């Protein structure tokens, strides 16, 4: 492709004790205006890992389909619960897809964030592809990776892509604590995306919050 014709906003991934918190709005701007305001960006890729976008939304299907396909292929060879593709594998594979595109000139403008649980100590050896209490993780079994369009890849404790890198990350680099509660994490993002409502020209409401816990991949939809 050439030129970010249908861009996207920025997502925020923060980890805590019960799981991974992610958030994204539903605005898909056509450059200078809000063409689509009800699109999804937080994509479910497994029963334990998800991935978000930024950048051109059109160059995400060439990455979403090339990723959800690998999940079904891995699910068809699930001879043990430990054979599930860990988030370390998906993040390293996505970086390889961007690196082979970087060798050419077309880079497929995106700044994919991959988050998930990098462990197998919580029984989920049964997959429900087509649709009680939480647990406490040791902060090392929670993988959150970032991938730039240039192929830059790493992993940390809190990642924020796109245009919120200059806004969200600043408020979040000093306010982030270890083993935050569930109400602490959602109140941290709620006060964070508010800053991204009066400054980002391409952002909106409909914060599709998605949490990845030791029991599934939930979905919620506030409006601030």
């Amino acid at each position: 492709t050439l030129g970010p014709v249908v861009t996207g906003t920025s997502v925020i991934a923060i980890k805590y004790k019960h799981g991974i918190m992610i958030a994204a709005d539903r605005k898909a701007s056509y450059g200078s205006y809000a063409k689509f305001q009800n699109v999804e960006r937080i994509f479910k890729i497994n029963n334990k890992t998800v991935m978000g976008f930024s950048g051109e939304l059109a160059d995400a299907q060439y990455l979403h389909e090339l990723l959800t396909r690998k999940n079904i292929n891995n699910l068809s060879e699930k001879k043990r619960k430990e054979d599930m593709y860990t988030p370390q594998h998906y993040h390293s594979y996505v970086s390889r897809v961007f690196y082979v595109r970087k060798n050419r000139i077309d880079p497929l403008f995106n700044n994919i964030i991959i988050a998930g649980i990098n462990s197998q100590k919580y029984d989920n050896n049964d997959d429900n592809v087509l649709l009680e209490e939480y647990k406490e993780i040791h902060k090392d079994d929670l993988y959150i990776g970032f991938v730039d369009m240039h192929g830059t890849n790493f992993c940390d404790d809190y990642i924020t892509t796109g245009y919120a890198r200059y806004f969200a990350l600043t408020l979040l680099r000093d306010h982030y604590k270890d083993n935050m509660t569930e109400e602490e994490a959602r109140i941290l993002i709620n006060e964070c995306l508010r800053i991204l409502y009066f400054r980002d020209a391409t952002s909106s409401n409909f914060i599709q919050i998605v949490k990845v816990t030791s029991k599934g991949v939930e979905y919620e939809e506030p409006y601030i």
């Binding site: 970087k102 240039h150 830059t152 890849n153 890198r165 200059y166």
Partner: protein, 211 residues
């Protein structure tokens, strides 16, 4: 679309009799905003030879993993750990394998091969390997190289500090990297002072100026 960016960073190399010192910084800075303060820029290969680099991370994680592939393929086909002279010539052709699209990542090869023989190989981004007793590579290339130049080669009439023990020289690299963070922007804070003695390598860390 320009596919060449610079993540910024530095690697410092020193030698002596039976020791080489490789030190880096873990600031994986993006275009103008620091993203993560921890991204190691040095990776061990054998038990006596490491590699440092400073270009874009796209051409570093690939180049470090590609070198680990071609070096692990060689150890189980010869049952002998490669020396540095062979690993230096190995990167000479990998970087030249992409002459039309060079790897935007300069490198550093340090290690010991003989009983003592502290060697240190450094080169450009195209593949012209050249041995050197000391070198610097990265964003703070033009700022640390003259400092190190006043310790090994001399210009003074009195050749001062002839001896060079590993104890004092370790504090010297910490002094040079601290002198880089104050005057250069891309120089990181968390440093990894890798020291390769006769028995192995160390993971001596140090946290610098978070600025």
């Amino acid at each position: 679309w320009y596919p060449y960016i610079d993540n910024g960073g530095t690697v410092i190399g020193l030698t002596g009799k039976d020791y080489v010192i490789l030190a880096a910084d873990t600031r994986l800075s993006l275009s103008y905003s620091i993203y993560t303060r921890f991204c190691p820029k040095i990776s061990k290969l054998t038990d006596k030879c490491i590699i440092g680099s400073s270009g874009m991370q796209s051409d570093i994680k690939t180049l470090h993993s590609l070198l680990q592939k071609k070096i692990q393929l060689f150890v189980l086909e010869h049952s002998h750990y490669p020396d540095i002279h062979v690993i230096a010539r190995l990167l000479c052709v990998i970087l030249y394998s992409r002459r039309f699209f060079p790897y935007y990542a300069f490198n550093i090869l340090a290690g010991v091969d003989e009983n003592n023989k502290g060697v240190l190989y450094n080169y450009d981004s195209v593949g012209s390997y050249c041995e050197a007793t000391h070198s610097c590579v990265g964003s703070g290339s033009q700022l640390i190289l003259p400092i190190l130049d006043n310790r090994v080669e001399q210009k003074n009439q009195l050749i001062k500090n002839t001896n060079f023990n590993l104890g004092d020289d370790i504090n010297f690299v910490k002094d040079a990297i601290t002198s880089a963070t104050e005057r250069d922007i891309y120089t990181g804070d968390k440093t990894l002072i890798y020291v390769i003695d006769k028995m192995g390598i160390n993971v001596n860390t140090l946290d610098l100026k978070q600025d």
